């Protein structure tokens, strides 16, 4: 119903929600979708997960839920207000496009709820080896509530619980509406991965998803925040630099206890005993991207 | 644009926002408006002030505002999302009506902002002697963040600062859009007061506003929350029981220092030296209401 410079948006439109634990390729994924001529994701809104969390807290409190129900502010009203708020933020914080998309990592803790609010929405759950994600948080000093960066053990424990929840939500939403996307397979085989992802989304193939680095900052392309912690990685083409760099840099006691700390590794198909797991041939495309990146073809932006 | 069982609602519609410090007649005011056939206010939503406060905090933080601006979540986007959220809650948490109304006391701390979000909205700032409001909070044990009920001095200090802010907002919005409504004049002269208020609002007179006790719980009437602290007072007709009952029950040192603790009393036209100020003849209507109330004509509801 609501319009934009002529695109119409509403609760029945086919939204794409991207998420996962931070440092799992979520920015790369949404940037590759942003490259598509029909899709716009844009930057992390930050406020969508905040308001979702507050609204969830309201109903989890017995005392507050009683007061809200007695005020006529029922689940039905809260849900309508969440729909309207989320739609405005998604629609207005970036360029209009036929298919709107949002990437705020921890929103996928609420994919069951979002799939009911937005009955035609679909979900991409980014999955990356928790050892790589946690190594990224600690070495880059990425602040995430609840993740004590002084402890690999604590961060892997918290990674495990977060992805356990999001994976359970993805399974409950079901295979027609939520697709786990493995970062390692995305970087090894981006063409095959995006072919599968766009088929799942019901969106026609476009080569543009393999050209996202051409489209940084351009109209209809990839809008980046200079403050977000993945920006200087996503300005490069898909490459292998970050695939395995955690290995040998995790404390020995955590390596020993890996499968007990992070049982979701094996649940998701990762080898929690290998340092590191042995992946097969990357596509020639990514091998060439990688040597260009490592020899300095992509300069650090002045901004 | 948006519809309801056929009433249309949107950001240009003529909303009424009622507010003031709690225990200042805000529930009585909105109940008298609810009695009008064209207006529905309903219960305190609770969540409108919460989300307003959070959204204000976002922009007050230099670091967070930079991140939001870099994400495309500008003031323009935040404002659109606030409009959509607030409208859904106002519209859906009670019955539809031609004129929608909201009463959440501390929202009038933001009347300048709300008047810009909703350019045809108008505001009723309830004003009651701060000694009566604070006496009410303390004796009824009404929990309000920042008000230490063990201290008349602290509560009057906090009352003073709250009404100072809301009155300044009312003056900035200007006389065409915000009307201070004095509780004491409402209860002494309800017909005259409501005539002035409905004229200010641009709404035709209806006798119903002087019959709100007939309309409790009825369709098109006054919906109450059994948990709100004013409910067992507002089920009675306008009466004088609460006009002056604070007098002699305030600690002597606070009486001595009243004008220094609460300079807004004199600013608003109250006599901060009188215990209590001497009001003139109540309307016969209210005198009769009062003896009926005090002799027990209105039974305590079983619920
Ligand atoms: N073009 C690209 N090719 C491969 N990985 C990329 C990439 N752009 C970003 N990534 C990876 O995405 C990870 C961040 O994920 P997220 O966006 O969910 O926070 C970073 O991992 P590292 O910090 O281990 O390098 C980054 O290397
Ligand atoms: N019918 C009525 N006539 C007069 N005052 C009323 C009333 N219904 C409620 N009020 C007063 O409204 C005050 C509460 O204001 P609010 O709704 O803003 O919290 C209560 O003051 P007291 O607690 O001093 O009795 C209550 O007495
Ligand atoms: Na695009
Ligand atoms: Na930006
Ligand atoms: Na009404
Ligand atoms: Na109710
Ligand atoms: Zn290219
Ligand atoms: Zn390392
Ligand atoms: Zn009557
Ligand atoms: Zn008393």
Swiss-Prot record, chains A, B:
Subcellular location: Golgi apparatus membrane
Lineage start: Eukaryota, Metazoa, Chordata, Craniata, Vertebrata
Glycan attachment points: 288
Protein name per UniProt: Protein-tyrosine sulfotransferase 2
Result, substituting residue 23 to A: Strongly reduced enzymatic activity
Name of the encoding gene: TPST2
EC number: 2.8.2.20
Lumenal compartment spans: 1-303
Claim: Transmembrane is one of the keywords in the record: yes
Biological function: Catalyzes the O-sulfation of tyrosine residues within acidic motifs of polypeptides, using 3'-phosphoadenylyl sulfate (PAPS) as cosubstrate.
Keyword annotations from UniProtKB, A to Z: Disulfide bond, Glycoprotein, Golgi apparatus, Membrane, Signal-anchor, Transferase, Transmembrane, Transmembrane helix
């Amino acid at each position: 119903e609501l319009v934009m410079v002529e695109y119409r948006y509403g609760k029945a439109m086919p939204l794409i929600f991207v998420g996962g634990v931070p440092r799992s390729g979520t920015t790369l994924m949404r940037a590759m979708l942003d490259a598509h001529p029909e899709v716009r994701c844009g930057e992390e809104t930050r406020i969508i997960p905040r308001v979702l969390a507050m609204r969830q807290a309201w109903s989890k409190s017995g005392r507050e839920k009683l007061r809200l129900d007695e005020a006529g502010v029922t689940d039905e009203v809260l849900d309508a207000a969440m729909q309207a708020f989320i739609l405005e933020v998604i629609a207005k914080h970036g360029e209009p496009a036929r298919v709107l998309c949002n990437k705020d990592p921890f929103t996928l803790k609420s994919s069951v709820y979002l799939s009911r609010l937005f009955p035609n929405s679909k979900f991409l759950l980014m999955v990356r080896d928790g050892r790589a994600s946690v190594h990224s948080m600690i070495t880059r000093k990425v602040t995430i509530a609840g993740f004590d960066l002084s402890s690999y053990r604590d961060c892997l424990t918290k990674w495990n619980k977060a992805i356990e929840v999001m994976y359970a939500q993805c399974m409950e939403v079901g295979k027609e509406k939520c697709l786990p996307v493995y970062y390692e397979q995305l970087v090894l085989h981006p063409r095959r991965s995006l072919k599968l992802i766009l088929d799942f989304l019901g969106i026609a193939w476009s080569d543009a998803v393999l050209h996202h680095e051409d489209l940084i900052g351009k109209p209809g392309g990839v809008s980046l925040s200079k403050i977000e912690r993945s920006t200087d990685q996503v300005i490069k083409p898909v490459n292998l630099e970050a695939l395995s760099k955690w290995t040998g840099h995790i404390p020995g006691d955590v390596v020993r206890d890996m499968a007990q700390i992070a049982p979701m590794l094996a649940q998701l198909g990762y080898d929690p005993y290998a340092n590191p797991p042995n992946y097969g041939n990357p596509d020639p495309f990514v091998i060439n991207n990688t040597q260009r990146v490592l020899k300095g073809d992509y300069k650090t932006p002045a901004n």
